RNA sequence: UACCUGGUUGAUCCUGCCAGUAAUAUAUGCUUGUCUCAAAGAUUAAGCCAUGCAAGUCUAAGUGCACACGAGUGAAACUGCGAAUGGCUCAUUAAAUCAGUUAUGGUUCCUUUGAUCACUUGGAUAACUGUGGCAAUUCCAGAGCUAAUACAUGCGCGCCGAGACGCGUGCAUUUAUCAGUGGUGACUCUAGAUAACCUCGGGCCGAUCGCGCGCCGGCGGCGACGGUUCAUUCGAAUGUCUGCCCUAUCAACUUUCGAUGGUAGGUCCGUCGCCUACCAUGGUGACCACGGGUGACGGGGAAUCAGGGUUCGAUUCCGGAGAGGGAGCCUGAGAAACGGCUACCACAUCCAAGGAAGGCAGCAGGCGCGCAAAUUACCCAUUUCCGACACGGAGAGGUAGUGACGAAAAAUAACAAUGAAUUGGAAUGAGUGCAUCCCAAACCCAUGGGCGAGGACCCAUUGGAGGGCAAGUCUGGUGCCAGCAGCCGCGGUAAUUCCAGCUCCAAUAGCGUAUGCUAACGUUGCUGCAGUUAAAAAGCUCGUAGUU
RNA sequence: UACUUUGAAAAAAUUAGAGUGUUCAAGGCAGGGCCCCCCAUUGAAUACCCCAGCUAGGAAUAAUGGAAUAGGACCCC
RNA sequence: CCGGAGCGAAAGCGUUUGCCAAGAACGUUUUCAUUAAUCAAGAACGAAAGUCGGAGGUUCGAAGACGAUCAGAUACCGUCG
RNA sequence: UACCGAUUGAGCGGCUCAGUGAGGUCCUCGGAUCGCGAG
RNA sequence: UAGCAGCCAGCUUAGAACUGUCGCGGACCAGGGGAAUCCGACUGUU
RNA sequence: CAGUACGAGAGGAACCGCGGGUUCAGACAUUUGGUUCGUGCGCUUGGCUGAGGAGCCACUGGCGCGAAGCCACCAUCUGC
């Protein structure tokens, strides 16, 4: 008997067809367009959508005005609008079945810092996040998969210690200044 | 096993104690006392997790051994004392008096009462034993035996007794229309008046309770604790007495409060 | 040792069952007391929970009661005459429950001659009291025959193997007539 | 994601399986830079174990005339209370365990809570002192003392009869009798009374310790501890109803020697064929008894799933069971206890050969067994438990070490001109020390500043490239050889399949293989398969259970 | 009395799921806001838990009983 | 005569006549009023061949003998059986 | 690779008949020894 | 009326206690057994 | 004697002396064992003397122990 929990769940799932050409093209297209490292990040965001769609699909089975459907349905809808993947105009349980994997891939931290003009390309966006350059509301984030919500959208900027923003130069800037 | 157990696992502890998972393997097994193991709250939990006056179990030992805590007027030095329903905890160092009453949900509350209210408590009669020489006795829910009671007190009524004297000052007749509090079974903490008492000979009697907002419910007879005569309570009711706002009603109450905070 | 468990018995269907555990201590049994008739010898044994039981091994005196009247006098036991379980307990003179014994009758005729002032086994205010009692003083003929011999036919209603006392009552009424024909059928 | 593809033929449409495909289990091959979390001698062997450790325990308050000390501080011992909890393993165990349900008005219960109930006696003993035995042990013996919270002693009603006493102080205990204070669906309940009983191996009414001196030999302050009888609480035992896998190549089983029931008793904490004695001849079974098998502990659960299902559950939570194999008992509130004892069996240790002693399916570690599983480490600081206790102890537990069982995050480059080991300046990590933080001390992470990248030599592997199945009519070698290949096949001197070079593909700090398991499989079909000819309807009819 | 609906009752952990920026996530049950405290009753929900047993409604469907050798049901009294 | 005709639960059943019991269908404004359908372990019947005990034994004919045929022929064909 | 096979084939386990039966526990009495009692 | 009273009559069976030196069908009476081969079936006869 | 002579080793003697034994021979009964109809003592089955006591009968009723004799490399002693 130990004071541990031993709870752990996977975040992705491998496809049934290992070498389906029609699948490899659309997954590689998502990798290069959003600057991903491997196919696991594609299968992860697909598994994330599958959990949300399955949760909404269960609520569509329940009839309207149900205390469980009204509570869990409104909680799931407001949670999607919070992260920005769902619009405020039409927040219904049936529009969750019209969500694509690209909607979640646009809320990552590497894609937001690229759209905000702070980074040159999408690949340049991921390399500076891992190098402790950008922050979100005075919080330095080192993870590119940081799902930015709408409340923290206008607070993504460079850190107060990075040379890109306002701070001391890097190790190789002063190194070249000392030698010459 | 070969005898009585002395340990208690933290995951096997009652859920209403609100104990976490990664702090330790064992939970404080409440020592033997007036209240049952599943229906009480140890003194260590009340001072460390509820009041947060002590951060560890050793500090609770130092708090109790200085003779500061006193349950029902008597000073206690056992950190695992089973402080149960309607019990009074007096802290003369800070002038604080607590009475363990359930929440709107099935959990105990840090409910501070005044000094004049801390002088008494409410005890539910369990049995009436006729001792030697025809002397009647009252067995309350906290094992208190009181001799020569009012002959109008019956097997399911409550009495208001003093903590220093130990005698009955008044009592509430268990009948319809009187206020009652549920002490377990998916309705723990709800307060309402009694409407009907179904009698099933040979099994448990289920009564029907209706709160102020009209959300009538039911429970067994062994879970009802009369706390008031009619519609006026004899003890200070906690905030959020027995309404049991649904998960939808609580959500709107929280959102409207965050915007006003 | 001696066990009172039921996991060694066959099931109601008739099939053997296998034991789930060893012999537990809360299932122990102890040998019989076999209370003989002699000088008082009572051994005390500690039982579960720290309590005490009294193993009466030998007994000679017993507090027997009278049914018709109210006369419970500590009297001496002579011998056993009938047992419903088996007649082997009558040979060894074993004192058990619900066994018919021959008890002495001197204190009963002493009380009767001191209460009604009439032979049994052979002031103005005070005389009126006894005359009121003589109106209801007839004894059944089955008892008067026993008082002539000095031996009353009693029945042990106590458990000497548990409490250590061979108490009981005097047989009267239809119960006395039942055990008389049981003994006379054996004596014949 | 409610999915299919190769293979019988010259070709075709089918039944069908073999093969492919994707998770999940252990094991293994190759490979590995950060950070977090975490399983880990279960499978064969409930096999055998060196050594250390794992249960001990003082308050102002049961005893305390050695040390060291101005009474106190501290030891040994006795009296207490614990050691019956925890931990470990899964051998046994198929209405047994267990899970819901429910009863005990068929029971007992240490501790905890509340009720109740002589101004001081007697005799021993340990520690201590001292004489000693044995080859040897938590081995003892002889003698001399002395304490108790040790062990024993002790201060109105019914009868009678001139309406004056005596017995019951009272509660327990046991039996008998009879009038119906307060309860319960329902007492042969709880209380009243009478008659006595009341165990010498006799039930109880404090011959007890504290800090304190305040006053009129006397009354007083506050606490500790102990006992009786009732409550409670932690429970524990024994029952109620329903629910277990495979097997008929197990169809009748049980009953001298208890199987089913009745009666009386014994016994037990209490109920009961639990046992004995006398009677009755029953009890179970085709709705599967009984017997056998289980690589069977049960369940909460786990894996995979469109819906149904299939499989797994030695494993941290609950219950049960057992400490080499069985059996027996002591102490106690609680044990049929084994980190208690006594036997036989197996195994094994020391020995002057007379004897003595042993139980790691506890924590480390060793051996053996195997495809298969880690340090003879640190601390009681957190979590709790035990104890005369705020102070002690705890391999329970916690923290490190080993660790690709697994799960999460996530480097191996980014940005600009010029036609690439070309060039160019920027950017933080890996690593490395130094402070701080962290933590019982340490370690790890995190925060700073000082070093730290140009083949940013600080180099990404693992399987494939005929089809299924994403990817070379390339080049050299071999010539049905060596080898490849899950399947179909390839190699017969011009091999897209072998051995290599180059190139390419897939997933990626992983990946291949072997064996189970799941979906594939509507190839076990309840949902949902088939039986004219591909495997298949008894030769036919009657006939009870069963189903309808 | 099967079915059906409701209620009572039920160990947690696990699963589902509400809230909450451990830098994100697996997870945890904590923590958020203002200048020695106060407010957010700071929070630490809720659902599921087969079958059987218990309880209260419904009376379709499927079984089952009632008067036939009548003294059968009500009265009379 | 003898049929893609009849009957029987199937196997099976073909001269005339008599006897015994049974059966389907049809007819009915008769009667009983659910008595029914299919049915594990059970049971009746069941071609030909084969077995046992008797009677019988015309034809046919396993085995076997012989005559052919053939490379061989213990086969096909033929004569006895 | 299984099968039949004289060899009362051989080995290793489970539950038991009968006999022998260690060691506890109770019951009867037995009194080394100690101050009628404890033993 | 779940039959009782009186009287008479033998011979067997079962169980139990106690007891002698564990001896007890105490003399007498009174099958050794098992696994196989050969021959003849068996009883009978010579 | 001796692990010596001898032998490269591996291996490996003999005389004197000492202590026993094999086979055989001649005896012997203290001891152990066999026998026991001193029919010695106890017990016991069936029957018989009326019973107790004491005894008898069953070609030695049976059983346990057993003196004296005799006896065995089955005990012991001697052998130039
Ligand atoms: Mg032969
Ligand atoms: Mg021969
Ligand atoms: Mg012959
Ligand atoms: Mg040599
Ligand atoms: Mg001799
Ligand atoms: Mg004789
Ligand atoms: Mg003769
Ligand atoms: Mg003879
Ligand atoms: Mg002899």
TrEMBL record, chain A:
SUPFAM superfamilies: Alpha-L RNA-binding motif
GO molecular function, one term: structural constituent of ribosome
Keyword hit for Cell wall biogenesis/degradation: no
Top-rank taxon: Eukaryota
GO biological process: nucleate erythrocyte maturation; ribosomal small subunit biogenesis; translation
Family: Belongs to the universal ribosomal protein uS4 family.
NCBIfam families: PRK04051.1, uS4_arch
Family annotation (Gene3D superfamilies): RNA-binding S4 domain
Domain RNA-binding S4: from-to ranges: 107-178
GO cellular component, one term: cytosolic small ribosomal subunit
Known function: Component of the small ribosomal subunit. The ribosome is a large ribonucleoprotein complex responsible for the synthesis of proteins in the cell. Part of the small subunit (SSU) processome, first precursor of the small eukaryotic ribosomal subunit. During the assembly of the SSU processome in the nucleolus, many ribosome biogenesis factors, an RNA chaperone and ribosomal proteins associate with the nascent pre-rRNA and work in concert to generate RNA folding, modifications, rearrangements and cleavage as well as targeted degradation of pre-ribosomal RNA by the RNA exosome.
Pfam family membership, one: S4
Protein name: Small ribosomal subunit protein uS4
Gene: rps9
Annotated ranges, domain Small ribosomal subunit protein uS4 N-terminal: 2-106
Keywords of the record: Ribonucleoprotein, Ribosomal protein, RNA-binding, rRNA-binding
């Amino acid at each position: 008997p130990v004071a541990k929990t031993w709870v752990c769940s996977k975040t992705y799932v491998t496809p049934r067809r290992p070498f389906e050409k029609s699948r490899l093209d659309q997954e590689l297209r998502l990798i290069g367009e959003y600057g991903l490292r491997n196919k696991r990040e594609v299968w992860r965001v697909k598994f994330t959508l599958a959990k949300i769609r399955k949760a909404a699909r269960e609520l569509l089975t329940l009839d309207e005005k149900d205390p469980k459907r009204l509570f869990e349905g409104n909680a799931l809808l407001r949670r999607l609008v919070r992260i920005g993947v769902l619009d405020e105009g039409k927040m219904k349980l049936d529009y969750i079945l019209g969500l694509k994997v690209e909607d979640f891939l646009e809320r990552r931290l590497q894609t937001q810092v690229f759209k905000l003009g702070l980074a040159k390309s999408i690949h340049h966006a991921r390399v500076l996040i891992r190098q402790r350059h950008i922050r979100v509301r005075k919080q330095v984030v080192n993870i590119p998969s940081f799902v930015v919500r709408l409340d923290s959208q206008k607070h993504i900027d460079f850190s107060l210690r990075s040379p890109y923003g306002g701070g001391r130069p890097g190790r190789v800037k002063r190194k070249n200044a000392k030698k010459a | 096993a070969r005898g009585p157990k002395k340990h208690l696992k933290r995951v096997a502890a009652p859920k209403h104690w609100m104990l976490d998972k990664l702090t330790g393997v064992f939970a404080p097994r409440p020592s033997t006392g007036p209240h049952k193991l599943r229906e009480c709250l140890p003194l260590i939990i009340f001072l460390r997790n509820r009041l947060k006056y002590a951060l560890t179990g050793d500090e609770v030992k130092k708090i109790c051994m200085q003779r500061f805590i006193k349950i029902d007027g008597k000073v206690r030095t056992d950190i695992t004392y089973p402080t149960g329903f309607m019990d009074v905890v007096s802290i003369e160092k800070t002038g604080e008096n607590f009475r363990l009453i359930y929440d709107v949900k099935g959990r105990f509350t840090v409910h501070r009462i005044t000094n004049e209210e801390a002088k008494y408590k409410l005890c539910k009669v369990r049995k009436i034993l006729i001792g030697t020489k025809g002397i009647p006795h009252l067995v309350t829910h906290d094992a208190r035996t009181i001799r020569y009671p009012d002959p109008l007190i019956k097997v399911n009524d409550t009495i208001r007794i003093d903590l220093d004297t130990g005698k009955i000052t008044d009592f509430i007749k268990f009948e319809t229309g009187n206020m009652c509090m549920v002490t377990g079974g998916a309705n723990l903490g709800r307060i309402g008046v009694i409407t009907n008492r179904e009698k099933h000979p040979g099994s448990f009697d289920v009564v029907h309770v209706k709160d102020s907002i009209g959300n009538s419910f039911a429970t067994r007879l062994s879970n009802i604790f009369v706390i008031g005569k009619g519609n006026k309570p004899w003890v200070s009711l906690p905030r959020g007495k027995g309404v049991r706002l649904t998960i939808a009603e609580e959500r709107d109450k929280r959102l409207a409060a965050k915007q006003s905070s | 040792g001696i066990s009172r468990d039921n996991w060694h018995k066959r099931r109601r269907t008739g099939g053997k069952r296998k034991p789930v555990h060893k012999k537990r201590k809360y299932e122990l049994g102890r040998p019989a007391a076999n209370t003989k008739i002699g000088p008082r010898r009572i051994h005390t044994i500690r039982v579960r929970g720290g309590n005490k039981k009294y193993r009466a091994l030998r007994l000679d005196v017993g507090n027997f009661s009278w049914g018709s009247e109210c006369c419970t006098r500590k009297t001496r036991i002579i011998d056993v005459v009938y047992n419903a379980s088996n007649n082997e307990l009558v040979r060894t003179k074993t004192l058990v429950k619900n066994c018919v014994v021959l008890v002495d009758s001197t204190p009963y005729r002493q009380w009767y001659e001191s209460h009604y002032a009439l032979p049994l086994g052979r002031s103005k205010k005070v005389q009126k009291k006894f005359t009121l009692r003589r109106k209801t003083a007839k004894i059944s003929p089955l008892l008067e025959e026993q008082f002539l011999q000095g031996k009353l036919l009693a029945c042990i209603s106590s458990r000497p193997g548990q409490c250590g006392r061979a108490d009981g009552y005097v047989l009267e009424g239809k119960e006395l007539e039942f055990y008389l024909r049981k003994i006379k059928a054996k004596k014949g």
